[PDB]
Design a protein around this ligand. Structure first.
Ligand SMILES: [K+]
Ligand SMILES: [K+]
Ligand SMILES: [K+]
Ligand SMILES: [K+]
Lengths: 127, 131
């Protein structure tokens, strides 16, 4: 129920393309649920990012040069996992939202466990 | 693929025997599952013989030769009792149409229960309360 949905939300990330099922199950369990009040800041531009997000319900507002509104199914902060780079922009709950978070450290160690996974992440990293 | 994983997950997750089991567990079950396709008419299991696996219908139909014949389709499951009791196959099951199946071998089941003993408690309790 929450599992398959979560599965499908995680399965839509590019970055997870070449990973096997056993690994998606891992990324999924590692997901931390969060609800943000309309208007609260999720992440501010410039600060170090240690997690990526998945919109489950509601909307977030990405303060790019041109503001975009992302809704359920959207994910952002992907670079917090491939690079050490700060957040590239400020993100806020446009409406009260429901997010799923994935901390770098969780993914950092998922790769640490299997050499085969660390190599997959390497390849799959350039866009 | 990852597509058939999700449906092999939903297939299993819908069977009562796997009740209140955390994902962490159902993941394991899904990977002990062995895929099989049976030609229309071939016998899957004959009444009286020892059973060492249960089945899950993925696609097509099987024919259970009970007192009254029943036709089970996608989502159905049988042979459960073999994984917990030495008793025989109580009926003759064969593919009605060409059928795609997934089986859980008794032995593969036990290595799962060796991990989390809950599995065996929940499986057996449900299985019998049904009978
Ligand atoms: K804005
Ligand atoms: K049925
Ligand atoms: K049917
Ligand atoms: K039966």
């Amino acid at each position: 129920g929450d599992f398959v949905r979560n599965w499908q939300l995680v399965a839509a990330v590019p970055l997870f393309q070449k990973l096997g099922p056993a690994v998606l199950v891992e990324i999924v369990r590692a997901l931390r649920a969060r609800t943000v009040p309309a208007g609260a800041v999720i992440c501010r531009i410039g600060e170090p990012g240690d997690r990526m997000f998945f919109v489950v319900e509601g909307s977030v507002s990405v303060a790019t040069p041109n503001p975009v509104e992302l809704g359920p199914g959207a994910f952002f902060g992907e670079m917090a996992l491939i690079s050490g780079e700060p957040r590239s922009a400020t993100v806020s709950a446009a409406t009260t939202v429901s997010l799923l978070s994935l901390h770098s450290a969780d993914f950092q160690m998922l790769c640490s466990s299997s050499p085969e996974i660390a190599e997959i992440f390497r390849k799959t990293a350039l866009e």
